[PDB]
């Protein structure tokens, strides 16, 4: 169509979507002990007056070797959001970019009896496909996920799971004749 695959590659929004997609993927399980947390302390090493040395409060101040850290890593989160319309706009830019190029190449529903990577790699090679292809299927599939997810660069995913990060990660799409109608019905 042209509401999904003919739109301008809106880069100011596509970038925000990519940045969000990666910021929401950090853990942030990193901490550090301040004056309160570092063990010990709580005694004045010497008198305030009458020794030649500098006046010091505890052995666990910042400058002391072995002290607490002043500021630094806090256990926190990085995920944020943006308006839904901008989400759909970014996820349509990420596909209009593939249609601008020849990244997209429709195919039919695959056929497998059990998962096997040999025929899958063969089909991928007989279609002049570059290394990283995104294999978008209608529903979640078992005979495709398994025979695909051992290869260096093949990522299978379903219309329920399209990503602004992973459309743009790849440079060659492999959608089925059914999932494409799924995405054009869903996407606005």
């Amino acid at each position: 169509s042209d509401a999904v695959f003919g739109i301008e590659p809106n880069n100011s929004v596509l970038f925000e979507a990519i940045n969000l997609q990666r910021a929401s993927l950090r853990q942030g399980t990193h901490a550090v002990k301040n004056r309160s947390a570092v063990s010990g302390g709580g005694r004045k090493p010497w008198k305030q007056k009458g020794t030649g040395r500098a006046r010091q409060g505890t052995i666990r101040a910042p400058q002391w070797r072995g002290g607490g850290i002043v500021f630094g890593p806090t256990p926190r989160s990085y995920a944020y959001k943006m308006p839904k319309k901008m989400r759909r706009l970014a996820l349509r830019s990420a596909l209009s970019f593939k249609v601008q190029e020849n990244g997209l190449t429709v195919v039919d529903a695959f056929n497998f009896e059990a998962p096997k990577t040999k025929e899958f790699k063969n089909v991928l090679s007989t279609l002049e496909q570059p290394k990283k292809v995104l294999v978008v299927t209608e529903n979640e599939d078992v005979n495709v996920e398994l025979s695909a997810r051992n290869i260096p660069g093949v990522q299978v995913t379903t219309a329920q799971g399209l990503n602004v990060l992973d459309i743009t990660n790849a440079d060659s799409l492999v959608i089925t004749e059914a999932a494409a109608k799924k995405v054009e019905e869903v996407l606005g």
């Binding site: 970038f15 990519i18 743009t168």
Partner: protein, 144 residues
């Protein structure tokens, strides 16, 4: 293209990072000036009240009370209605649906900031005195 990524122009800045040398501008005193109460860590007169002269909002007299049974309404002019057609008996739930009202505070009240040039049959809680006449000029009798 995940290795050529440019954000929009004017959409990201460096944070100012004070306390890193004289060349940046904010090196030694880090923008705070010299000695004082506004140069200490955490030091600052609280907002408005300060500790000295009598503040403004403890020097002016209190005024009025506040009613518990306020009951104010959701305004609707004669222009939010123009998005409709003729015939069109209007319901205070219907008027919430066409993109006009989102909260019947205490009902809707029809006001007369505009003009119809239409013929609708409005139902609501309270009306104006200009709104009622502007509706009745084009038929479409109004009712509570």
């Amino acid at each position: 293209k995940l290795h050529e990524l440019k954000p929009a122009e004017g959409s990201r800045k460096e944070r100012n990072r004070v306390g890193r040398g004289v060349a940046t501008g904010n090196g030694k005193t880090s923008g705070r000036g010299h000695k004082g109460q506004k140069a200490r860590s955490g030091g600052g007169v609280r907002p408005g009240f300060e500790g000295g002269q009598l503040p403004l909002f403890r020097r002016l007299p209190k005024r009025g009370f506040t009613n518990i049974n306020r009951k104010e309404y959701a305004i609707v002019n004669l222009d939010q209605l123009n998005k409709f057609e003729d015939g069109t008996e209007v319901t205070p739930a219907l008027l919430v649906e066409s993109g006009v009202v989102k909260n019947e505070k205490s009902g809707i009240k029809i006001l007369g900031n505009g003009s119809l040039d239409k013929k609708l049959t409005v139902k609501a809680h309270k009306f104006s005195a200009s709104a009622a006449e502007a509706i009745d000029a084009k038929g479409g009798a109004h009712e509570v």
